[PDB]
Design a protein around this ligand. Structure first.
Ligand SMILES: [Mg+2]
Ligand SMILES: [Mg+2]
Ligand SMILES: [Mg+2]
Ligand SMILES: [Mg+2]
Ligand SMILES: [Mg+2]
Ligand SMILES: [Mg+2]
Ligand SMILES: [Mg+2]
Ligand SMILES: [Mg+2]
Ligand SMILES: [Mg+2]
Ligand SMILES: [Mg+2]
Ligand SMILES: [Mg+2]
Ligand SMILES: [Mg+2]
Ligand SMILES: [Mg+2]
Ligand SMILES: [Mg+2]
Ligand SMILES: [Mg+2]
Ligand SMILES: [Mg+2]
Ligand SMILES: [Mg+2]
Ligand SMILES: [Mg+2]
Ligand SMILES: [Mg+2]
Ligand SMILES: [Mg+2]
Ligand SMILES: [Mg+2]
Ligand SMILES: [Mg+2]
Ligand SMILES: [Mg+2]
Ligand SMILES: [Mg+2]
Ligand SMILES: [Mg+2]
Ligand SMILES: [Mg+2]
Ligand SMILES: [Mg+2]
Ligand SMILES: [Mg+2]
Ligand SMILES: [Mg+2]
Ligand SMILES: [Mg+2]
Ligand SMILES: [Mg+2]
Ligand SMILES: [Mg+2]
Ligand SMILES: [Mg+2]
Ligand SMILES: [Mg+2]
Ligand SMILES: [Mg+2]
Ligand SMILES: [Mg+2]
Ligand SMILES: [Zn+2]
Lengths: 99, 104, 124, 138, 83, 208
RNA sequence: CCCCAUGUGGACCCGCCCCUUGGGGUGUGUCCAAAGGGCUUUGCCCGCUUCCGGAUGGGCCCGCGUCCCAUCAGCUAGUUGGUGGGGUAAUGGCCCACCAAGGCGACGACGGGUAGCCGGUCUGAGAGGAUGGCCGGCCACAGGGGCACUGAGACACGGGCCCCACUCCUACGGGAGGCAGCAGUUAGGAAUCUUCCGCAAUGGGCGCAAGCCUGACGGAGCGACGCCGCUUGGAGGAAGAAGCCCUUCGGGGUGUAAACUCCUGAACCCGGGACGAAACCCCCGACGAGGGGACUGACGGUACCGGGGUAAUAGCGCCGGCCAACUCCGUGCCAGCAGCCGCGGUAAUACGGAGGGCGCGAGCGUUACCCGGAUUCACUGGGCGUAAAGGGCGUGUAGGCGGCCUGGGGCGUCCCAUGU
């Protein structure tokens, strides 16, 4: 018995928890934003978007999101947002949005 | 080289997709005579351009759907149901030879 | 048949049928004796062929010839079957291997001993 | 219908020679004439010539035989002991230049049809080409 | 990681290696990427070590990492001598 | 173990003389002298028309018992002589005559083929210096086959190399009776051998 | 582990350019870096971050090829396509919502059975048939079923979770396991090995290194299981011992075989004793190139060399024809032989022994199975009046096949080069 490299499992659980936590924050903010753009409220829609953008790229920093996983997230976040903002939007903060 | 094939559109019943019936020939591996088999490919037709009876060139592409890895490269010669006929008439004999039997 | 016919139906390959369901197609099978009867020959031949019903480990119950001048097989004697019919005894498809298990070899066998499983006699 | 013109001709020839006809007619076709050209050159037939039968084109094929013989059955030995069709409709037969057969250990020929024309096995091998294996004569 | 190493090809007591360019993960006697030399441990013949230094240098040119013993043979055929 | 048993009995079965003893097989006693009929209780009875098999069989057995070789080894030589270019028949005989143990016999060192086999075996032989105790060893063209120095003093070797004075040697060989050396010049050809054999039938026998 | 900064750069949105499925460039906006350690310690070493490129390995897609049965003929609803979306490194019904009503099949769908596939291997004149063990390539599985986590990479044999079966511990609540790794045990079977030595060599993981780990591997062990090599002696030696066998009782055979004489001398003894090992490392030199130096073998005191040295295992099948090898005796359709034809009921070359013989020989013979012979599934290379075989006849679908002449095309077909 005892293959002291159980440690691996021991650590997997942590990392699992660390990742899981990053992503849920990500999703929450993503909607949060999409829903603001949704309702047409410009300003704070971008402000939040930028955070989302940030958390995502940081998630890809270590091995949470990592790769193009980050890229997909960001893109599938600026399109939906700018469009939904076509409701008399006018991207104020124009944060993650090359006006 | 992305494989290119030529066949006839035997079906225009789907959206943005067509059924091309590519014919093929070759020598029987043991009896040598030139036999001739054939296969149907579902090709992508975005513009809904190609119509029933068209001869087209199919081109190996990136999957578009399950069972669909070809795009209609181009049209070789329009209209000519004389071919669609064979295909349909053959489908028609199937409508039997089971518990009844295929016409003639 | 026309070439086109050959292309359509083609030749059918022949299927040989075994003549020894010693199952597993094994080379030998061991069974237990049940009856050490003595059948009579067929068509012309006449004599008292020594036979034995055998319960194989292959699940089959068969009849086997017992080669040799004289044997020592009884009711529950363990034996080895080797496959090989006997032209005169309809129903006997295997021979019993002498010199294996409970079947003793033939006594006073000074020739084809390899068969009849008898050790080399020490010439005085 | 006349299913195989080429085979029809080799047979007309095989048939006529077996009864020792001097001549023998076969409906003319460019291709058939091409074959006869070899038959003559290779010395299997005295030769042949265009002719008109009932108004339609034919090719007289002048047959050739050995001399009269001794003993019973003085019938001449044939010059064309053999002549069999090979490639046939619904069983076409083509060969690469490396697969061109060597008929009767060289004493017989084989007529091929190449993109370089109708040639004998030797001719073909020379020109280094292959193609439909029309027939075999010896 | 791509390596330049030996591959047992001899026979019992008659070992004969093949200086090879394989992936670190293969069987030692598995499928290599290219052969670039051979080595006869027992110098049973006057020709007990060929190396085709041309190719080696190419592999090293791109990450090929030689086993120690492989390098020592590559050195012998002056794959490194930069005179 | 190659045969080893009464041998003048083979001489008899083949109804032809076999020099499986070098000497004696001359002195009115090879048995083929006033007794050339096959061995056994039936030898004197009339012989029946042999079957094609019998003939091919007897022919091979001859060619083979001549070199006291096992069918096993014999056969392999044949299948070897069948693949190599050139009239299998002779090519086969060439290889048979290239056996170190045969050569020794051919060069007069030993009186018989058996004897030579032993001389080679017991180390009393050389091949380009290095000693070779393998009777099946195949001698190539351009090889010196000398007697082992340590044995050059052996009674046996001195007698045979003595009587060997004068005795000529095969045109594919040559020997220096001085240093008891000899060379394998070339592979003998069918003509070079006066073998009472018809390889024709030997080839045919392995055809069956 | 996180936040801020620095932005070489890179990612995302939008515009534009070149490209042409999601390839490359560019402008504004946004977004995203890092770790230190060691010394012969002001320099070198190990290492960290972002980007581009190479190299290696891999995912996915496509053409063609890949067993049997039609006493399996119709199969299909995520099923076929579409639009939007999720998920992934990535395409895709892979997954989801909605829409359409498609998709597949006699060129054999669907179903049943069998089977890892290939390089190759066996056989065969070949075509072909059979096969896929050892070795190498790929795939699949890790007591059965399902599932994800962590990671560059796994759905992960010696990691995790649940269910199932089974084994073990249990204070009966609950726990612990998975040799299809090496060796070994047990069961089953006609049948398949040592609980061995070593890390010296090759290879692999971590480490700057020294070095640690390595049942991978290198070896030894057992088993004629296969192949190859070798011995059981060589020369002489009677018109021919004895014994045994046969006989026309004269004699013939075993047989130069033996005995005996001389020669060599496997085993066995004595001494020497190996390659496989050169690196890593140390020293000089820039931790480079190069030079020198040291350490290290399981096998093993084995191979091999030298000296000494004894004539020192032979068996198994067969002898009626196919098929090479014949006599006497015993037996009496018995006892038995037998692959086929067959043999034995008082003269048996066929049963049993003996003598003699033939074959092969540390093997010989049997059983099983594959190819052959079998042109007996016939493409090479067969047939259908009477031997097995023309459909009771017609009409006609699909399909197979197609007169003569010319021109275009060049799909088949043929040639060359090239890549594989
Ligand atoms: Mg939330
Ligand atoms: Mg043969
Ligand atoms: Mg920052
Ligand atoms: Mg520091
Ligand atoms: Mg690449
Ligand atoms: Mg989709
Ligand atoms: Mg299976
Ligand atoms: Mg054949
Ligand atoms: Mg062959
Ligand atoms: Mg083959
Ligand atoms: Mg195969
Ligand atoms: Mg196995
Ligand atoms: Mg198990
Ligand atoms: Mg992950
Ligand atoms: Mg395990
Ligand atoms: Mg058992
Ligand atoms: Mg090691
Ligand atoms: Mg190592
Ligand atoms: Mg003697
Ligand atoms: Mg070391
Ligand atoms: Mg006979
Ligand atoms: Mg018998
Ligand atoms: Mg009697
Ligand atoms: Mg018999
Ligand atoms: Mg008898
Ligand atoms: Mg056949
Ligand atoms: Mg027939
Ligand atoms: Mg009939
Ligand atoms: Mg009729
Ligand atoms: Mg009838
Ligand atoms: Mg009827
Ligand atoms: Mg028709
Ligand atoms: Mg035509
Ligand atoms: Mg047509
Ligand atoms: Mg034309
Ligand atoms: Mg072409
Ligand atoms: Zn003699």
């Amino acid at each position: 018995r005892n293959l002291s490299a159980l440690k691996r499992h021991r650590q997997s659980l942590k990392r699992r928890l660390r990742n899981k936590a990053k992503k849920s924050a990500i999703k929450t903010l993503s909607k949060k934003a999409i829903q603001l753009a949704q309702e047409g409220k410009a300003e704070e829609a971008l402000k939040i978007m930028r955070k989302a953008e940030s958390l995502i790229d940081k998630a890809a920093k270590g091995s949470t999101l990592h790769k193009n996983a980050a890229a997909r997230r960001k893109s599938r976040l600026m399109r939906k947002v700018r469009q939904l903002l076509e409701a008399a939007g006018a991207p104020l903060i124009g944060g993650g949005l090359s006006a | 080289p992305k494989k290119v094939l030529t066949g006839v559109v035997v079906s225009d019943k789907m959206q943005k997709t067509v059924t091309v019936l590519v014919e093929r020939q070759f020598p029987h591996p043991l009896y040598g005579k030139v036999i001739k088999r054939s296969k149907k490919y579902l090709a992508h037709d975005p513009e809904e351009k190609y119509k029933l009876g068209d001869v087209v060139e199919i081109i190996e592409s990136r999957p578009i759907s399950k069972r669909k890895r070809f795009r209609v490269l181009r049209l070789v010669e329009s209209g000519r149901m004389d071919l669609v006929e064979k295909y349909l008439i053959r489908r028609q004999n199937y409508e039997s030879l089971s518990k009844r039997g295929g016409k003639a | 048949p026309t070439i086109n016919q050959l292309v359509r139906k083609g030749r059918e390959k022949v299927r040989k049928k075994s003549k020894v369901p010693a199952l597993k197609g094994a080379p030998f099978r061991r069974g237990v004796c049940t009856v050490v009867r003595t059948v009579t020959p067929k068509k012309p031949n006449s004599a008292l062929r020594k036979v034995a019903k055998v319960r194989l480990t292959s699940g089959y119950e068969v009849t086997a010839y017992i080669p040799g001048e004289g044997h020592n097989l009884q009711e529950h004697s363990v034996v080895l079957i080797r496959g090989g019919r006997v032209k005169d005894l309809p129903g006997v498809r295997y021979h019993i291997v002498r010199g294996v298990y409970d079947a003793a070899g033939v006594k006073d066998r000074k020739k084809s001993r390899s068969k009849y499983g008898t050790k080399k006699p020490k010439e005085a | 219908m006349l299913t195989d013109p080429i085979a029809d001709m080799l047979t007309r020839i095989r048939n006529a020679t077996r009864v020792y006809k001097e001549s023998t007619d076969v409906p003319a076709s460019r291709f058939k004439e091409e074959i006869l050209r070899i038959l003559a050159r290779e010395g299997f037939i005295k030769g042949y010539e265009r002719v008109d039968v009932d108004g339609k084109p034919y090719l007289r094929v002048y047959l050739k035989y050995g001399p009269r013989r001794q003993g019973p059955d003085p019938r001449p030995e044939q010059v064309i002991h053999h002549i069999r069709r090979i490639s046939k409709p619904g069983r076409r037969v083509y060969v690469g230049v490396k697969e061109i057969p060597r008929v009767r250990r060289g004493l017989g020929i084989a007529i091929l049809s190449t993109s370089k024309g109708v040639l004998t096995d030797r001719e073909a091998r020379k020109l280094g080409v292959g193609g439909e294996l029309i027939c075999e004569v010896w | 990681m791509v390596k330049i190493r030996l591959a047992r090809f001899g026979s019992k007591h008659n070992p004969h290696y093949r200086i090879v360019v394989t992936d670190a993960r293969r069987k030692r006697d598995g499928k290599y990427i290219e052969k670039i030399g051979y080595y006869d441990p027992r110098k049973t013949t006057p020709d007990w070590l060929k190396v085709d230094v041309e190719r080696a240098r190419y592999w090293l040119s791109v990450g090929a990492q030689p086993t120690d013993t492989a390098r020592r043979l590559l050195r012998q055929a002056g794959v490194f001598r930069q005179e | 173990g190659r045969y080893i048993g009464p041998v003048c009995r083979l001489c008899r079965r083949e109804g032809v003389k076999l020099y499986l003893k070098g000497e004696r097989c001359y002195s009115p006693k090879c048995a083929m002298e006033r007794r050339p009929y096959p061995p056994g209780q039936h030898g004197q009875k009339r012989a029946r028309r042999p079957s094609d098999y019998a003939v091919r069989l007897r022919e091979k057995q001859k060619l083979r018992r001549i070199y006291g070789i096992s069918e096993r080894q014999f056969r392999n030589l044949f299948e070897e002589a069948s693949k190599k270019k050139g009239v299998t028949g002779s090519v086969f005989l060439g290889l048979l005559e290239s056996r170190l143990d045969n050569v020794v016999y051919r060069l007069g060192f030993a009186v018989s083929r058996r004897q030579a086999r032993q001389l080679v075996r017991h180390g009393h032989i050389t091949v380009n210096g290095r000693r070779v105790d393998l009777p099946s060893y195949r001698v190539r063209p351009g090889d010196e086959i000398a007697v082992a120095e340590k044995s050059r003093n052996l009674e046996l070797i001195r007698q045979n190399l003595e009587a060997m004075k004068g005795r000529k040697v095969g045109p594919w060989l040559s020997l220096d009776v001085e240093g008891m050396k000899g060379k394998f010049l070339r592979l003998p050809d069918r003509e070079d051998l006066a073998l009472p054999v018809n390889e024709q039938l030997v080839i045919e026998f392995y055809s069956r």
